[PDB]
Amino acid sequence: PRSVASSKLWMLEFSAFLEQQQDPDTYNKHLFVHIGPYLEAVDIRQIYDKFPEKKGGLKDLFERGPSNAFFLVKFWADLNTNSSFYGVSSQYESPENMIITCSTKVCSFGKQVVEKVETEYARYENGHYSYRIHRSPLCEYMINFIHKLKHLPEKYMMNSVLENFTILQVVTNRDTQETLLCIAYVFEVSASEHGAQHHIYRLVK
């Protein structure tokens, strides 16, 4: 409905975080971003340049389909934070058993700087098929990018940096190379007293 779901895969939960070990049995976890009436539509040609234009690129993936698998996620990240682990945990569900591949492309000024792949086998669960990417360590680029942002003294300076910083996540059926889900991520700094916020949009032409 308002879910990040295509015809074959559904992302139930997504979250980036910093976990600090206070003592041998105490762990503090800070959530930077988290997912878990109807979805507003967005013209993909408005964000096209912010992502790399190439074979395998966003325009090339959208044009090959299925168009029901494309989303744009606007995140307002919680940066109020002070042993350390930086990680990403995601949960997908499918009605069919598959071997999925989730590729993440970190982009600065539209050009890809970093990329990581994960491959997940289905875990049968109550007639559903689960894919749980549990504590995928955040790359050094991101950890050093979160660090640099925190050094700027005012949030306007921080958002200014994030107007040329995006992430593209392409979850693919490994054997068939079908686009299962393709999420485009844009960021701002949260000012909310209720933690990290987000807006999900369906990408259209």
Binding site: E40, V42, D43, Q46, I47, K74, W76, E163, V186, E188, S190, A191, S192, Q197, H198, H199, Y201
Partner: peptide, 16 residues
């Protein structure tokens, strides 16, 4: 084109 000047819903710039 500035992100605030692009053809995007008003909510894009309005945090929930």
């Amino acid at each position: 084109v500035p992100l605030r000047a692009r053809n995007l819903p008003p909510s894009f710039f309005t945090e929930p």
